[PDB]
Design an enzyme around this catalytic site. Structure first.
Site, PDB file in Angstrom:
ATOM      1  N   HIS A  80       7.186 -50.821 -42.640  1.00 30.94           N
ATOM      2  CA  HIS A  80       6.983 -49.720 -43.577  1.00 30.94           C
ATOM      3  C   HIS A  80       6.651 -50.244 -44.970  1.00 30.94           C
ATOM      4  O   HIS A  80       5.773 -49.703 -45.652  1.00 30.94           O
ATOM      5  CB  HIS A  80       8.239 -48.844 -43.599  1.00 30.94           C
ATOM      6  N   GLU A 126       5.128 -37.886 -46.050  1.00 28.82           N
ATOM      7  CA  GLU A 126       6.079 -38.897 -45.611  1.00 28.82           C
ATOM      8  C   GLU A 126       5.331 -39.980 -44.845  1.00 28.82           C
ATOM      9  O   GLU A 126       4.362 -39.693 -44.138  1.00 28.82           O
ATOM     10  CB  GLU A 126       7.181 -38.270 -44.740  1.00 28.82           C
ATOM     11  N   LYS A 145       8.896 -36.126 -37.414  1.00 24.24           N
ATOM     12  CA  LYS A 145       8.741 -35.984 -38.859  1.00 24.24           C
ATOM     13  C   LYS A 145       8.634 -34.520 -39.270  1.00 24.24           C
ATOM     14  O   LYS A 145       9.229 -34.110 -40.275  1.00 24.24           O
ATOM     15  CB  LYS A 145       7.521 -36.767 -39.340  1.00 24.24           C
ATOM     16  N   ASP A1113     -15.287 -49.481 -10.953  1.00 20.09           N
ATOM     17  CA  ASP A1113     -16.578 -49.150 -11.529  1.00 20.09           C
ATOM     18  C   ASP A1113     -16.552 -49.547 -12.998  1.00 20.09           C
ATOM     19  O   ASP A1113     -15.496 -49.574 -13.633  1.00 20.09           O
ATOM     20  CB  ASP A1113     -16.885 -47.650 -11.341  1.00 20.09           C
TER      21      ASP A1113
END
EC number: 2.7.7.48
Length: 1566
Positions: A80, A126, A145, A1113
């Site tokens: 953070h 925030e 949040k 594929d």
RNA sequence: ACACAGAGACGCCC
């Protein structure tokens, strides 16, 4: 980068504006890796960031080098802190600074930065960063949040005057960013890059240190301890493994890990294969000598003619050479009688004496008619008079079994057509018939009646039968259903459906489906020799003579009708001939199985769907009438013929025209080469339709090679001209040509396989075994320039593994192995054995079913995983990590691994329980690695739609304006049984820590000695035949291997299994193959980027390479910017050669390219089945329309409509409009009422007339929806509108007003359930023990009793009822419809009938006046607010007005947030009940925040109590088992749709979609 | 009539 510019540019309006979550991906290439040093000491962390590499500016230029440290207290938020260093302004504004006071308790939270603008506009945000790899973490953190910082910040809005507040949260994770503000996709890259660096710092700090760590959980400690103890104490006895399993030595693994890859061999092999590919390109496309593209195209055309003329000289030589045949295509008469009423009119003007003269069918019909007329008619037609008595008052169906005399000639003539023909095989006339029936047809057979049928047929003319019994009944039911939405829009579409229902083909299909429905109930009956059953259809006077046989074998029928009765007939010569016996038309005996009673019952509904689909796709409006065009008739007739033939090879010829027609999209210098699929169209021809289809396919094969599809760039969008239907010869647009490839999907998937055709799957399984190398030196030990089959190169494998490490470390950082180890340990240690024991089947082939001449009198059964984990519970294990050691010991002691084969369809490798336990850990380990791969889609679902679309953004930024994109679709040959397990073991062990090496080696090595068990009934008919006369090599070899004439390397003498060493299986090993092919594709991407750095003459061709990979594929995308015509030509030649080299480079990795790969296509690519023609994404809607009626077996009648809506929404997501979806829902209404007994039960008029007075979905009522928003709203929305519009809500009030002091009709449909219950030994106390102590249900499994009780609860669940069933749903369900209304079938003890329930609800539950009070509304429907604000927008269009606008050429896939989630609900209620009951923390609400909802729920639901015992005694739920399902099943859930159409950037989007997507080219407007 | 480059089914049971 600064927050002030973002806050100044944001659009904020007064009030509560929250925006929408916008997801941004990682689309740009990050520059470099900031090498750094981390040292742990008491004074900080001392992060020393070095000089970051920087070749391209932006997205990584904001990092400043220096010495920065963090003290050992803020060490849990390094991510953070570092991620938002440039955004986390030090303002620290508490909520009491910008708001005066509220005193709400949570008044001291500071939502990061709440910086405002000049005009007082408060903006709150925030910051959050999570370590997640999917959107399942992003959306979860978003919701957390919002739920944490929404109601605090919204409580201060009402007190203020004119608030302007905006709330949004930014969540950053490595791989994607989710936010609310309009990010610029340039600083999002900055945020993701800094998050990656911060994650690197935190991981390096957490490694050598141990005190700096967030307390994760108490639960995630035991799992890690258990897993570590297991992987530290598990010794698989490797010294025995090498001697037991072939080709398994740990020296190979250690040598692979500890040896660098040689570069000289790689360079030489690459340079050799490059010039080999160049030589092949020059030879096979006529590049030299230099010729213009007219004469080389003519050479291609004549050469394709030369190949296609040789197939019809080997198909014409192994067959009889008859050029004329009078065999019919459709085995049904073309009669259209008028729908009269129930009346037996067998009397004739001339008596039954003229029937005696015409053949044997006439004699049989005459004897039947004399028996019926001069006899007691008790079974021919049901009698409604003596039918009410078993229905209105308090298995036995009657049939007319007449026994005619018949002559020996007549009986022989019947026996020729299979009727009682087993006894008559030995005579001469039957042996000749049997000999002739095996012959295949010739490709030069004269078929022109089929071609005439598709051109001139009266299938779409209007028959004036719109005022008959069945049509009037359907009209009445439709009018009753469409009464809550009575507008003009509903009426126009109802008129269109009524007009479509009165076509010739639909009227014919009605009585054909009635006949099939009546035959489906006649299998369950038996009769003696010489007996027959006579009966009559309900609304049509058609008589059927039925001959049931065994209920798993053929059933025979013959049809008879009076000649004067047949008003109209269908036009065409594709119908079988009929017997003209006087004034009577008769039909030969025809056969029909139980698996072919599916396309006939569903025939009218499929016909209606085909009519509507092709009418809109030709552009015809649904509310208008037009003379049918010649294009609609051909498609309808083709659908009709394919549905009515129902053969396996007929599907394959139409399926293999896609790959024929994707050629022609190939641009120069490459030529279209469709003469590559001729090796697949080499099979027997057995029907006159297959010959016609083959000739048409060869015609279009030559036509494609003659000239390709043109490219016409008009402006900003490229368009292709020259497209044409494959088997029609007619020219149409692109989407019709794309979705006409799926007409073959109308054939039913679920066909049972006879014992005659079972040997082909064993041939497919054992075909690569004869190519096993004699000496294993190239199987993982050395290198080879030109490896043989099953062989690969170790150097190239190591190079690919190294190449897919520089695409992982560049996104998830240099420290990813530690995180991968932690995630794998957590995932393995957290699994209990109760998570296992699904409905999947095991096998019992251990040791005794090995010699054939022991089990002759024994019949072999499979098993289920339930008992195999129940016995482990009784012995006693609680965790999966404990049982795996015993499983390994069991596998090692009996040195093999057991497989049984069970297809019974049109494979499956069931496996022993111990092998499942062993391989579960390996699949878990591989899955955690597949989710770390940039371009791997089968583990990352979001990547299919998010990597081809993002190629344009890269090609636009990096190159510039105008770039020639060049794609190349690629699919592989036989992926299974073509991979050696050593490759998978080495690739998987390259990515593991040193502790997951012995386990993975031992677990993989068990796959290399297999033992597949073949069917015993196959061996019963194989021992008798000593020598074979077949003209097939495998059939000639298998019987010699079994008997002993040959010594074959995959079977022994007298054994009943098949040995195989070289091969993987479909299914079991799924993620490891994806990982290996991801490594290979990363190597290709790196090599292509390397070659683009060089060039034709040392000049670098600028361009970007994108790769998308799945499991089988793949595709490659390349875009370049020449800006010179000569450079255009030479660059395109270079790229074409580079893409052609992949076919030659593939076999170095043990991968074989298929013949169905399209190479060097400019603006086209298809990945799974999804076509990307520039800006014109096309999905085949016909694939999902053809599978609309694939309902499963359910007990509740309200559970049928949920499955119907689930099948309805998928076709809407596939490109369908809203009018089409409404018409498909009308067809589903018809199907539902047909399986409810529309034309099978005589007591349907009373039931319908009384259903008019009582609409109830749980009682058998079908709810429609608004014909403008036709598919988005589910069944819950329909139920809400029904209960708030009509008597349903008023009647439902008694369920909270009568019992104050959702389906209650459970069907009984079943012989192998009590056997399952007693097999695994559940005690007869499973309900009362939960009743006294409900602790075992919610908390956890602690010991044996909790596990046993939870397993007993799991078994007695509705899921097993749907899971344990046979594959034929529709015939079984419609068989019970013959007795549904009258006999006692339903349950509330006290079993009753549908009539009785409907009558008792009429006089007791209906006599009420009122409505449901708006407080119990938010319990059944806790999602009703957005129900109301969507219904309000839907209540804006009520008429049919607008204009026919011109289409917009920007069709893209969208996502509409119809039902996001109501945030005011503060999570769910079941966790709250567990909270207040069990003393367990389950809701995310703190002290007293858990309250303020208990009172609300008590007001919503009466008689609840905090104490568990009081809630038991108070209410009808006198248990703790039913209450869990009741509280859980009704709850708020998110709803979204993925509609396909024009793009929308930014509630007006829903109105936009309704106004555009109602009909293509039409706008409703106002 | 079904299945198949002729491996089956066209009934079990008394």
């Amino acid at each position: 980068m600064n927050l002030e510019v973002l806050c100044g540019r944001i659009n904020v309006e007064n009030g509560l504006s929250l925006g929408e979550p916008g997801l941004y991906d990682q689309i740009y290439d990050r520059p470099g890796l900031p090498d750094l040093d981390v040292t742990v000491d008491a004074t900080g962390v001392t992060v020393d960031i070095g000089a970051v590499p920087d070749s391209a500016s932006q997205l990584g230029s904001s990092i400043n080098a220096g010495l920065i440290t963090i003290q050992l207290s803020e060490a849990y938020k390094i991510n953070h802190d570092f991620t938002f260093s440039g955004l986390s302004k030090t303002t620290d504004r508490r909520l009491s600074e910008v708001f005066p006071i509220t005193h709400d308790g949570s008044d001291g939270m500071t939502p990061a930065v709440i910086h405002t603008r000049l005009d007082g506009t408060i903006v709150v945000v925030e910051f959050s960063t999570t370590r997640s790899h999917n959107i399942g973490g992003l959306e979860a953190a978003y919701r957390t949040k919002i739920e944490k910082y929404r109601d605090p910040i919204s409580r201060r809005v009402d007190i203020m005057e004119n608030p302007r507040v905006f709330f949004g949260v930014i969540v950053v994770s490595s791989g994607g960013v989710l936010s609310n503000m309009p990010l610029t996709q340039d600083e999002a890259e900055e945020l993701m890059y800094r998050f990656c660096i911060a994650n690197e710092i935190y991981t390096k700090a957490r490694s050598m240190d141990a005190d700096i760590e967030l307390q994760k959980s108490e639960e995630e400690l035991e799992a890690i301890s258990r897993a570590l103890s297991f992987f530290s104490l598990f010794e698989p006895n490797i010294e025995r493994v090498e001697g037991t399993f072939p080709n398994s030595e740990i020296k190979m693994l250690e040598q692979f890990l500890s040896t660098p890859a040689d570069v000289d061999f790689i360079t030489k092999t690459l340079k050799a294969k490059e010039v080999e590919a160049y030589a092949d390109l020059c030879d096979s496309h006529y590049l030299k000598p230099e010729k213009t593209i007219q004469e080389r195209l003519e050479i291609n055309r004549c050469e394709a003619i030369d190949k296609t003329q040789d197939l019809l000289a080997g198909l014409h030589a192994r067959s009889n050479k008859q050029t004329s045949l009078n065999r019919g295509t459709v085995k049904l008469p073309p009669w259209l009688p008028k729908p009269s009423s129930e009346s037996i009119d067998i009397k004739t003007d001339s008596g039954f004496g003229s029937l005696m003269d015409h053949g044997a069918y006439g004699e049989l019909w005459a004897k039947c008619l004399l028996d019926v007329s001069l006899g007691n008619v008790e079974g021919v037609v049901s009698d409604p008079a003596k039918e009410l008595d078993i229905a209105i008052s308090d298995a036995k169906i009657t049939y007319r079994r007449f026994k005619p005399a018949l002559s020996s000639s007549a009986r022989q003539e019947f026996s020729l057509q299979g009727v009682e023909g087993k006894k008559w095989k030995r005579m001469a006339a039957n042996q000749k018939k049997e000999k002739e029936s095996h012959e295949t047809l010739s490709p030069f057979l004269d078929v022109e009646d089929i071609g005439d049928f598709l051109t001139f047929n009266n299938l779409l003319t209007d028959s004036r039968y719109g005022d008959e019994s069945i049509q009037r009944a359907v009209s009445i039911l439709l009018e009753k259903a469409s009464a809550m939405q009575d507008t003009e829009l509903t009426h126009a579409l109802n008129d269109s459906f009524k007009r479509n229902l009165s076509s010739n083909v639909v009227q014919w299909s009605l009585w054909v489906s009635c006949l099939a429905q009546e035959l489906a109930s006649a299998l369950k009956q038996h009769c003696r020799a010489g007996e027959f059953i006579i009966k009559k259809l309900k609304f049509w006077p058609i008589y059927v003579i039925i001959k049931p046989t065994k209920s798993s074998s053929h059933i025979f029928y013959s049809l008879g009708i009076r000649k004067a009765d047949v008003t109209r007939r269908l036009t065409g010569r594709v119908f079988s001939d009929t017997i003209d016996a006087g004034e009577w038309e008769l039909t030969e005996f025809k056969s029909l199985k139980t698996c072919k009673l599916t396309n006939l019952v569903n025939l009218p509904c499929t016909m209606l769907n085909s009519i509507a689909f092709w009418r809109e796709k030709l552009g015809v409006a649904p509310w208008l009438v037009r003379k049918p065009c010649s294009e609609l008739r051909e498609q309808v007739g083709l659908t009709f013929l394919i549905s009515l033939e129902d053969k396996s090879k007929t599907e394959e010829i139409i399926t293999l025209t896609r790959y024929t027609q994707m050629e022609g999209f190939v641009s120069p210098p490459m030529l279209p080469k469709p003469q590559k699929m001729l090796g697949k169209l080499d099979g027997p021809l057995r029907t006159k339709l297959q010959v016609y289809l083959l000739r048409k396919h060869l015609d279009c094969m030559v036509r494609i090679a003659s000239q390709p599809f043109s490219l016409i760039p008009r402006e900003g969008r490229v368009e292709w001209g020259g497209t044409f239907h494959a088997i029609s010869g007619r020219s149409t647009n692109l989407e019709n040509m794309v979705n006409s490839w799926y007409i073959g999907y109308y054939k039913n998937k679920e066909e049972s396989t006879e014992l005659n055709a079972l040997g082909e799957m064993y041939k497919k399984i054992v075909e690569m075994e004869e190519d096993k190398p004699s000496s294993p030196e190239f199987l993982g030990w050395g290198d080879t320039d030109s490896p043989k089959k099953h062989e690969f190169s170790r150097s190239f494998l190591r190079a690919a593994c190294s190449s897919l490490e520089r695409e992982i470390a560049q996104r998830h950082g240099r420290q990813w192995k530690q995180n991968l180890e932690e995630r794998v340990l957590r995932e393995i240690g957290t699994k209990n054995i109760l998570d296992l024991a699904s409905m999947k089947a095991t096998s019992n082939f251990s040791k005794d079913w090995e010699l054939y001449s022991e089990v002759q009198t024994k019949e072999y059964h499979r098993s289920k995983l339930l008992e195999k984990m129940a016995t482990l519970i009784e012995k006693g294990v609680m965790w999966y990590i404990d049982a795996v050691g015993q499983a390994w010991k069991a596998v090692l002691d009996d040195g093999c691994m057991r497989i049984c084969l069970f297809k019974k369809n049109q494979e499956i490798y069931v496996m022993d329980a111990n092998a499942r336990l062993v391989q579960f850990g390996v699949e878990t380990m591989a899955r955690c690695v597949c989710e770390l791969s940039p371009h791997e889609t089968v583990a990352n679902p979001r990547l299919k739609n998010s990597i081809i679309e993002n190629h344009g953004l890269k090609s636009a930024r990096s190159l510039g304006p105008g770039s020639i994109n060049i794609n190349s679709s690629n699919d592989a040959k036989k992926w299974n049984q073509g991979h050696y397990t050593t490759k998978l073991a080495l690739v998987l062990c390259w990515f593991m820590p040193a502790k997951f090496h012995r386990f993975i080696w031992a677990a993989i090595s068990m796959f290399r000695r297999k033992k597949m068990m073949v069917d015993l009934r196959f061996l019963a008919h194989l021992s008798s035949k000593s020598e074979s006369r077949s003209s097939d090599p495998f059939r000639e070899a298998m019987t010699d291997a079994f008997h002993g004439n040959r010594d074959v390397s995959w079977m022994d003498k007298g054994r009943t299994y098949i040995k195989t060493e070289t091969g993987m299986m479909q299914g079991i090993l799924h993620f490891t193959s994806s990982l290996l092919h991801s490594c290979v594709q990363s190597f290709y991407k790196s090599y292509f980027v390397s070659k683009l750095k060089e060039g034709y003459m040392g000049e670098s061709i600028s361009g970007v390479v994108d790769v998308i990979e799945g499991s089988d594929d793949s595709a490659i995308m390349i875009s370049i910017r020449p800006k010179s015509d000569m450079d255009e030509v030479r660059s395109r030649f270079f790229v074409a050669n580079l893409l052609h080299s992949v076919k030659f480079l593939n076999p170095l990795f043990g991968i074989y390219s298929s013949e169905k790969s399209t190479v060097n296509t400019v603006y086209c690519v298809e990945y799974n089945s999804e076509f990307h023609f520039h800006r014109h994404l096309v999905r085949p809607t016909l694939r999902w329309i053809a599978a609309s009626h694939q309902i499963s077996e359910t007990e509740a009648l309200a559970s049928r409509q949920e499955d119907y809506s689930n099948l309805l929404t998928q076709c809407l997501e596939g490109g369908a409009s809203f009018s089409l979806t409404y018409l498909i829902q009308c067809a589903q209404l018809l199907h539902h009422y047909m399986l409810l007994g529309l034309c099978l039960h005589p007591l349907f008029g009373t039931f319908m007339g009384m259903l008019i007075s009582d609409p109830d979905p749980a009682l058998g009522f079908f709810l429609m929806d608004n014909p403008a928003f036709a598919g988005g709203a589910g069944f819950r929305f329909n139920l809400w509108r029904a209960c708030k519009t009509t008597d349903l809500g008023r009647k439902y009030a008694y369920y909270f007003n009568e019992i104050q002091g959702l389906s209650h009709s459970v069907m009984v449909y079943r012989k192998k359930y009590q056997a399952l219950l007693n097999r695994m030994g559940l005690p007869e106390d499973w309900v009362e023990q939960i009743d006294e102590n409900p602790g075992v249900l919610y908390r956890r499994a602690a010991n044996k009793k909790e596990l046993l009780l939870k397993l007993a609860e799991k078994v007695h669940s509705p899921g097993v009822t749907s899971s344990l069933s046979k594959g034929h749903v529709v015939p079984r369900v419609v068989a019970a419809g013959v007795y549904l209304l009258s006999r006692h079938c339903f349950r509330f003890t006290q079993k009753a009938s549908l009539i009785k329930l409907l009558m008792m609800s009429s006089i007791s539950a209906m006599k009420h006046g009122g409505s449901l009070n708006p407080n119990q509304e938010r319990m059944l429907f806790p999602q009703a607010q957005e129900y109301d604000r969507v219904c309000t927008l839907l209540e804006e269009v009520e008429h049919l007005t607008g204009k026919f606008v011109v289409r917009e050429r920007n069709i893209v896939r969208s996502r509409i947030d119809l039902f996001q989630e109501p945030v005011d609900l503060r999570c769910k209620a079941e966790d709250l009940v567990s909270e207040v009951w069990f003393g367990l923390k389950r809701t995310k609400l703190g002290p007293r925040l858990l309250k303020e909802e208990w009172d609300k729920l008590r007001a919503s639901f009466a008689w609840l109590s905090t104490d568990p015992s009081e809630t038991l005694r108070d209410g009808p739920f006198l248990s703790h088992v039913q209450f869990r399902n009741f509280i859980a099943h009704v709850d708020a859930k998110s709803r979204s749709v993925r509609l396909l159409g024009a793009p929308v950037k930014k509630v007006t989007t829903i109105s936009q979609v309704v106004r555009m997507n109602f009909f293509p080219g039409f706008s409703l407007e106002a």
